Point group: C4
Amino acid sequence: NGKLKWKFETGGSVHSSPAIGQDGTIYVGSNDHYLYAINPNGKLKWKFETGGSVHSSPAIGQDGTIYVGSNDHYLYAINP
Amino acid sequence: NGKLKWKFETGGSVHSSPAIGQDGTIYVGSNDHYLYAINPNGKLKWKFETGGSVHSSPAIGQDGTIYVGSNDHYLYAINP
Amino acid sequence: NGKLKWKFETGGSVHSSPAIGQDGTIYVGSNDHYLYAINPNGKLKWKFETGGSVHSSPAIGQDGTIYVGSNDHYLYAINP
Amino acid sequence: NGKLKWKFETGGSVHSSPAIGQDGTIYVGSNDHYLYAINPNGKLKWKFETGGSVHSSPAIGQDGTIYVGSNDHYLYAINP
Ligand SMILES: [Zn+2]
Ligand SMILES: [Zn+2]
Ligand SMILES: [Zn+2]
Ligand SMILES: [Zn+2]
Ligand SMILES: [Zn+2]
Ligand SMILES: [Zn+2]
Ligand SMILES: [Zn+2]
Ligand SMILES: [Zn+2]
Protein backbone atom coordinates (compact mmCIF):
# COMPACT_ATOMS: atom_id res chain seq x y z
CA ASN A 1 0.00 0.00 0.00
CA GLY A 2 3.11 2.20 -0.19
CA LYS A 3 3.82 2.46 3.54
CA LEU A 4 7.35 1.95 4.78
CA LYS A 5 7.97 -1.48 6.24
CA TRP A 6 11.58 -0.80 7.22
CA LYS A 7 14.81 0.77 5.97
CA PHE A 8 18.29 -0.61 6.52
CA GLU A 9 21.27 1.75 6.56
CA THR A 10 24.43 0.76 4.70
CA GLY A 11 27.63 2.82 4.65
CA GLY A 12 27.19 4.22 1.13
CA SER A 13 24.89 4.63 -1.84
CA VAL A 14 22.95 1.47 -2.67
CA HIS A 15 23.23 1.49 -6.47
CA SER A 16 23.03 -2.32 -6.56
CA SER A 17 19.61 -3.89 -7.21
CA PRO A 18 18.36 -6.40 -4.60
CA ALA A 19 17.92 -10.14 -5.11
CA ILE A 20 15.57 -12.34 -3.06
CA GLY A 21 16.53 -15.77 -1.74
CA GLN A 22 14.38 -18.86 -1.32
CA ASP A 23 13.73 -17.96 2.34
CA GLY A 24 13.01 -14.30 1.61
CA THR A 25 16.52 -13.08 2.42
CA ILE A 26 17.35 -9.89 0.53
CA TYR A 27 20.86 -9.55 -0.91
CA VAL A 28 22.22 -6.21 -2.16
CA GLY A 29 25.54 -4.48 -2.75
CA SER A 30 26.52 -1.09 -1.41
CA ASN A 31 29.04 1.49 -2.54
CA ASP A 32 30.57 0.93 0.92
CA HIS A 33 32.15 -2.26 -0.66
CA TYR A 34 29.91 -4.80 1.14
CA LEU A 35 27.42 -7.38 -0.06
CA TYR A 36 24.54 -7.34 2.44
CA ALA A 37 22.23 -10.22 3.41
CA ILE A 38 19.18 -8.85 5.21
CA ASN A 39 16.39 -10.84 6.83
CA PRO A 40 12.79 -10.11 5.74
CA ASN A 41 12.29 -8.47 9.15
CA GLY A 42 15.05 -5.90 8.54
CA LYS A 43 17.78 -7.34 10.75
CA LEU A 44 21.20 -7.96 9.25
CA LYS A 45 22.00 -11.57 8.51
CA TRP A 46 25.61 -11.01 7.39
CA LYS A 47 27.68 -8.64 5.31
CA PHE A 48 30.66 -9.56 3.15
CA GLU A 49 33.49 -7.11 2.44
CA THR A 50 34.80 -6.96 -1.10
CA GLY A 51 37.66 -4.75 -2.25
CA GLY A 52 35.59 -2.02 -3.95
CA SER A 53 32.10 -0.63 -4.51
CA VAL A 54 29.48 -3.30 -5.26
CA HIS A 55 27.56 -1.66 -8.12
CA SER A 56 26.73 -5.09 -9.57
CA SER A 57 23.37 -6.64 -8.66
CA PRO A 58 23.50 -10.11 -7.06
CA ALA A 59 22.18 -13.30 -8.65
CA ILE A 60 21.23 -16.50 -6.82
CA GLY A 61 22.14 -19.92 -8.08
CA GLN A 62 20.06 -23.06 -7.95
CA ASP A 63 21.90 -24.14 -4.78
CA GLY A 64 21.53 -20.78 -3.04
CA THR A 65 25.00 -19.44 -3.89
CA ILE A 66 24.99 -15.65 -4.29
CA TYR A 67 27.11 -14.17 -7.09
CA VAL A 68 27.97 -10.49 -7.44
CA GLY A 69 30.62 -8.41 -9.17
CA SER A 70 32.71 -5.78 -7.44
CA ASN A 71 34.58 -2.77 -8.70
CA ASP A 72 37.66 -4.53 -7.33
CA HIS A 73 37.54 -6.54 -10.65
CA TYR A 74 36.30 -9.79 -9.09
CA LEU A 75 33.16 -11.85 -9.53
CA TYR A 76 32.32 -13.17 -6.05
CA ALA A 77 30.54 -16.41 -5.16
CA ILE A 78 29.29 -16.22 -1.56
CA ASN A 79 27.87 -19.15 0.39
CA PRO A 80 24.29 -18.41 1.56
CA ASN B 1 3.84 -4.32 -31.99
CA GLY B 2 6.00 -1.38 -30.87
CA LYS B 3 3.22 1.19 -30.47
CA LEU B 4 3.15 3.34 -27.36
CA LYS B 5 0.65 2.18 -24.77
CA TRP B 6 1.34 5.02 -22.33
CA LYS B 7 4.14 7.02 -20.74
CA PHE B 8 4.25 8.20 -17.14
CA GLU B 9 6.24 11.31 -16.23
CA THR B 10 8.43 11.25 -13.12
CA GLY B 11 10.43 14.23 -11.86
CA GLY B 12 13.83 13.02 -13.07
CA SER B 13 15.73 10.48 -15.15
CA VAL B 14 14.41 6.94 -14.74
CA HIS B 15 17.70 5.03 -14.54
CA SER B 16 16.07 2.34 -12.37
CA SER B 17 14.78 -0.80 -14.11
CA PRO B 18 11.10 -1.67 -13.56
CA ALA B 19 9.77 -4.66 -11.62
CA ILE B 20 6.31 -6.21 -12.13
CA GLY B 21 4.04 -7.27 -9.27
CA GLN B 22 1.64 -10.19 -9.08
CA ASP B 23 -1.26 -7.92 -10.14
CA GLY B 24 0.70 -6.26 -12.95
CA THR B 25 1.72 -3.21 -10.91
CA ILE B 26 4.96 -1.71 -12.22
CA TYR B 27 7.49 -0.47 -9.65
CA VAL B 28 10.43 1.75 -10.62
CA GLY B 29 12.78 4.28 -9.05
CA SER B 30 13.45 7.76 -10.35
CA ASN B 31 16.35 10.14 -9.94
CA ASP B 32 13.72 12.44 -8.38
CA HIS B 33 14.20 10.28 -5.18
CA TYR B 34 10.85 8.43 -5.40
CA LEU B 35 9.91 4.79 -5.79
CA TYR B 36 6.86 4.70 -8.08
CA ALA B 37 4.04 2.15 -8.15
CA ILE B 38 2.10 2.47 -11.40
CA ASN B 39 -1.06 0.61 -12.39
CA PRO B 40 -1.03 -1.34 -15.67
CA ASN B 41 -3.35 1.36 -17.07
CA GLY B 42 -0.80 4.13 -16.46
CA LYS B 43 -2.36 5.79 -13.42
CA LEU B 44 -0.22 6.31 -10.34
CA LYS B 45 -0.89 3.91 -7.50
CA TRP B 46 1.49 5.53 -4.99
CA LYS B 47 4.96 7.02 -4.80
CA PHE B 48 7.37 6.75 -1.88
CA GLU B 49 9.96 9.44 -1.15
CA THR B 50 13.44 8.28 -0.21
CA GLY B 51 16.31 10.58 0.70
CA GLY B 52 18.22 10.40 -2.61
CA SER B 53 18.12 9.23 -6.22
CA VAL B 54 16.71 5.71 -6.67
CA HIS B 55 19.17 4.25 -9.19
CA SER B 56 18.63 0.76 -7.75
CA SER B 57 16.08 -1.49 -9.46
CA PRO B 58 13.29 -2.85 -7.23
CA ALA B 59 12.80 -6.51 -6.32
CA ILE B 60 9.56 -8.12 -5.11
CA GLY B 61 9.45 -10.61 -2.30
CA GLN B 62 7.29 -13.68 -2.02
CA ASP B 63 4.78 -11.73 0.09
CA GLY B 64 4.65 -8.73 -2.25
CA THR B 65 7.11 -6.54 -0.33
CA ILE B 66 9.07 -4.25 -2.66
CA TYR B 67 12.76 -3.71 -1.89
CA VAL B 68 14.93 -1.02 -3.46
CA GLY B 69 18.17 0.76 -2.64
CA SER B 70 18.56 4.53 -2.60
CA ASN B 71 21.53 6.79 -2.96
CA ASP B 72 20.66 7.95 0.56
CA HIS B 73 22.54 4.75 1.69
CA TYR B 74 19.41 2.81 2.70
CA LEU B 75 17.84 -0.41 1.48
CA TYR B 76 14.07 0.18 1.62
CA ALA B 77 11.33 -2.39 2.20
CA ILE B 78 7.98 -0.94 1.11
CA ASN B 79 4.61 -2.54 1.77
CA PRO B 80 2.75 -3.24 -1.51
CA ASN C 1 30.07 -22.69 -26.35
CA GLY C 2 31.12 -19.03 -26.45
CA LYS C 3 30.96 -18.53 -30.22
CA LEU C 4 29.26 -15.44 -31.59
CA LYS C 5 25.75 -16.07 -32.85
CA TRP C 6 25.16 -12.51 -34.04
CA LYS C 7 25.63 -8.87 -33.05
CA PHE C 8 23.16 -6.07 -33.67
CA GLU C 9 24.41 -2.49 -34.00
CA THR C 10 22.51 0.28 -32.23
CA GLY C 11 23.41 3.98 -32.47
CA GLY C 12 25.04 4.25 -29.04
CA SER C 13 26.33 2.41 -25.99
CA VAL C 14 24.02 -0.39 -24.86
CA HIS C 15 24.12 0.13 -21.09
CA SER C 16 20.60 -1.30 -20.74
CA SER C 17 20.28 -4.99 -19.83
CA PRO C 18 18.20 -7.16 -22.21
CA ALA C 19 14.84 -8.76 -21.43
CA ILE C 20 13.44 -11.83 -23.22
CA GLY C 21 9.84 -12.13 -24.36
CA GLN C 22 7.61 -15.20 -24.47
CA ASP C 23 8.50 -15.76 -28.15
CA GLY C 24 12.23 -15.19 -27.63
CA THR C 25 12.18 -11.53 -28.68
CA ILE C 26 15.01 -9.59 -27.04
CA TYR C 27 14.23 -6.07 -25.79
CA VAL C 28 16.99 -3.62 -24.83
CA GLY C 29 17.56 0.11 -24.52
CA SER C 30 20.37 2.06 -26.12
CA ASN C 31 22.03 5.34 -25.28
CA ASP C 32 20.83 6.38 -28.77
CA HIS C 33 17.37 6.93 -27.05
CA TYR C 34 15.64 3.87 -28.57
CA LEU C 35 14.08 0.76 -27.09
CA TYR C 36 14.95 -2.11 -29.45
CA ALA C 37 12.95 -5.28 -30.12
CA ILE C 38 15.16 -7.84 -31.86
CA ASN C 39 14.13 -11.22 -33.22
CA PRO C 40 16.05 -14.30 -32.01
CA ASN C 41 17.60 -14.46 -35.50
CA GLY C 42 19.15 -10.99 -35.18
CA LYS C 43 16.79 -9.02 -37.42
CA LEU C 44 15.15 -5.90 -36.04
CA LYS C 45 11.51 -6.28 -35.10
CA TRP C 46 10.90 -2.62 -34.20
CA LYS C 47 12.56 0.25 -32.37
CA PHE C 48 10.80 2.90 -30.30
CA GLU C 49 12.22 6.41 -29.89
CA THR C 50 12.09 7.93 -26.43
CA GLY C 51 13.29 11.42 -25.57
CA GLY C 52 16.62 10.47 -23.95
CA SER C 53 19.11 7.67 -23.32
CA VAL C 54 17.49 4.38 -22.28
CA HIS C 55 19.80 3.29 -19.45
CA SER C 56 16.91 1.49 -17.73
CA SER C 57 16.52 -2.25 -18.38
CA PRO C 58 13.13 -3.36 -19.75
CA ALA C 59 10.63 -5.54 -17.90
CA ILE C 60 7.83 -7.60 -19.47
CA GLY C 61 4.37 -7.78 -18.02
CA GLN C 62 2.09 -10.77 -17.85
CA ASP C 63 0.31 -9.60 -21.03
CA GLY C 64 3.52 -8.96 -22.97
CA THR C 65 3.69 -5.20 -22.36
CA ILE C 66 7.28 -3.95 -22.22
CA TYR C 67 8.11 -1.28 -19.63
CA VAL C 68 11.31 0.76 -19.56
CA GLY C 69 12.48 4.04 -18.09
CA SER C 70 14.19 6.76 -20.09
CA ASN C 71 16.48 9.59 -19.12
CA ASP C 72 13.74 11.83 -20.51
CA HIS C 73 12.04 11.28 -17.06
CA TYR C 74 9.30 8.95 -18.35
CA LEU C 75 8.41 5.35 -17.63
CA TYR C 76 7.29 3.89 -20.97
CA ALA C 77 4.77 1.10 -21.56
CA ILE C 78 5.19 -0.25 -25.10
CA ASN C 79 2.81 -2.68 -26.78
CA PRO C 80 4.63 -5.89 -27.84
CA ASN D 1 26.22 -18.37 5.63
CA GLY D 2 28.24 -15.45 4.23
CA LYS D 3 31.56 -17.26 3.79
CA LEU D 4 33.47 -16.83 0.55
CA LYS D 5 33.07 -19.74 -1.84
CA TRP D 6 35.40 -18.32 -4.50
CA LYS D 7 36.30 -15.13 -6.34
CA PHE D 8 37.20 -14.88 -10.01
CA GLU D 9 39.44 -12.05 -11.22
CA THR D 10 38.52 -10.21 -14.41
CA GLY D 11 40.61 -7.43 -15.96
CA GLY D 12 38.40 -4.54 -14.83
CA SER D 13 35.48 -3.44 -12.69
CA VAL D 14 32.56 -5.87 -12.79
CA HIS D 15 29.66 -3.41 -13.03
CA SER D 16 27.57 -5.96 -14.93
CA SER D 17 25.11 -8.08 -12.93
CA PRO D 18 25.47 -11.88 -13.25
CA ALA D 19 23.00 -14.24 -14.92
CA ILE D 20 22.70 -17.97 -14.15
CA GLY D 21 22.32 -20.64 -16.82
CA GLN D 22 20.35 -23.87 -16.71
CA ASP D 23 23.48 -25.79 -15.67
CA GLY D 24 24.54 -23.22 -13.07
CA THR D 25 26.98 -21.40 -15.35
CA ILE D 26 27.39 -17.77 -14.30
CA TYR D 27 27.61 -15.15 -17.06
CA VAL D 28 28.78 -11.58 -16.37
CA GLY D 29 30.32 -8.65 -18.21
CA SER D 30 33.44 -6.79 -17.18
CA ASN D 31 34.72 -3.31 -17.88
CA ASP D 32 37.68 -5.14 -19.46
CA HIS D 33 35.32 -5.61 -22.54
CA TYR D 34 34.69 -9.36 -22.04
CA LEU D 35 31.59 -11.40 -21.36
CA TYR D 36 32.62 -14.15 -18.93
CA ALA D 37 31.14 -17.65 -18.56
CA ILE D 38 32.24 -19.16 -15.25
CA ASN D 39 31.57 -22.67 -14.00
CA PRO D 40 29.87 -23.07 -10.60
CA ASN D 41 33.25 -24.28 -9.27
CA GLY D 42 35.00 -21.02 -10.18
CA LYS D 43 36.93 -22.15 -13.25
CA LEU D 44 36.57 -20.16 -16.46
CA LYS D 45 34.40 -21.76 -19.10
CA TRP D 46 35.02 -19.15 -21.82
CA LYS D 47 35.28 -15.41 -22.26
CA PHE D 48 34.10 -13.42 -25.27
CA GLU D 49 35.75 -10.14 -26.29
CA THR D 50 33.46 -7.31 -27.32
CA GLY D 51 34.64 -3.90 -28.51
CA GLY D 52 34.00 -1.95 -25.29
CA SER D 53 33.10 -2.18 -21.61
CA VAL D 54 30.26 -4.63 -20.87
CA HIS D 55 28.19 -2.63 -18.37
CA SER D 56 25.01 -4.36 -19.55
CA SER D 57 23.81 -7.40 -17.58
CA PRO D 58 23.34 -10.61 -19.58
CA ALA D 59 20.01 -12.33 -20.22
CA ILE D 60 19.50 -15.99 -21.17
CA GLY D 61 17.05 -17.09 -23.81
CA GLN D 62 14.86 -20.14 -23.78
CA ASP D 63 17.43 -22.01 -25.90
CA GLY D 64 20.40 -21.00 -23.76
CA THR D 65 21.57 -18.10 -25.93
CA ILE D 66 23.20 -15.35 -23.85
CA TYR D 67 22.45 -11.74 -24.82
CA VAL D 68 24.35 -8.71 -23.54
CA GLY D 69 24.93 -5.14 -24.62
CA SER D 70 28.35 -3.54 -24.93
CA ASN D 71 29.52 0.02 -24.86
CA ASP D 72 30.74 -0.65 -28.40
CA HIS D 73 27.04 0.00 -29.40
CA TYR D 74 26.20 -3.65 -30.14
CA LEU D 75 23.74 -6.10 -28.64
CA TYR D 76 25.53 -9.47 -28.64
CA ALA D 77 23.98 -12.93 -28.92
CA ILE D 78 26.50 -15.54 -27.77
CA ASN D 79 26.07 -19.29 -28.17
CA PRO D 80 26.18 -21.06 -24.77
ZN1 LIG E 1 26.47 9.39 0.33
ZN1 LIG F 1 35.39 2.92 -2.03
ZN1 LIG G 1 16.49 15.63 -16.80
ZN1 LIG H 1 18.67 14.62 -5.79
ZN1 LIG I 1 30.19 5.31 -28.54
ZN1 LIG J 1 21.26 11.77 -26.18
ZN1 LIG K 1 40.17 -0.94 -11.41
ZN1 LIG L 1 37.98 0.06 -22.42
